[PDB]
Amino acid sequence: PPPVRLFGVEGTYATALYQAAAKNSSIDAAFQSLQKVESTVKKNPKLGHLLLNPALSLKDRNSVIDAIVETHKNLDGYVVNLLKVLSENNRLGCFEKIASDFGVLNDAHNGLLKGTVTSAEPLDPKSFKRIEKALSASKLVGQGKSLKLENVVKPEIKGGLIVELGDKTVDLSISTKIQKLNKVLED
């Protein structure tokens, strides 16, 4: 079965969509349409995102689907079969969730990886580049896979860095070292 299996419902949907469109080898098309519909949900911010709430019927839901393919009939069609399915299963609150999840699967198929450099403050671009280079250089990025290394600001972590990718982290941060230090002086 296609690489990367995202456990959990709604990602059971994503997995299905992913695997189905991988076997139809039209993942770029799917992804593109998913971005577009995700965008048109976001760009229908009231009265089409604020009515993803359940309350509507099956029959009222069907007319929501019709409105969705009315906004742009540039949809892939496998994702239109998915839209019907989501209507029938009467969930669409986790629609963009499924889209995001498909995105993870898709960009895994592309090979793209995401990382993180949580810090208390946004670091040098030099630091960003050096780490991206380093990670690509290191076996940590296997290559044939890319790194969107994202520094995030988490003031809660005081100074430091934590490099993250592939569920493998190196955490050289001041807070954590301080924790161990405080503890060693409680002895």
Binding site: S127, A134, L135, V170, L172, I174
Partner: protein, 50 residues
């Protein structure tokens, strides 16, 4: 002897709260900035060794 041991525990706890004061001083300094660079280059060395 009993009071001597008690006094040692008390001294250690006095110095413990003094350590908290030093921690606050350290996090005040732009050593807070400069050591981020230290962590960065050290991690470059670490991650390259992987």
């Amino acid at each position: 002897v009993r009071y001597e041991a008690s006094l040692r525990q008390l001294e250690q706890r006095q110095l413990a709260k003094s350590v908290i004061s030093r921690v606050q001083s350290e996090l005040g300094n732009p050593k807070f900035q400069e050591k981020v660079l230290q962590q960065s280059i050290s991690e470059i060395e670490q991650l390259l060794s992987k």
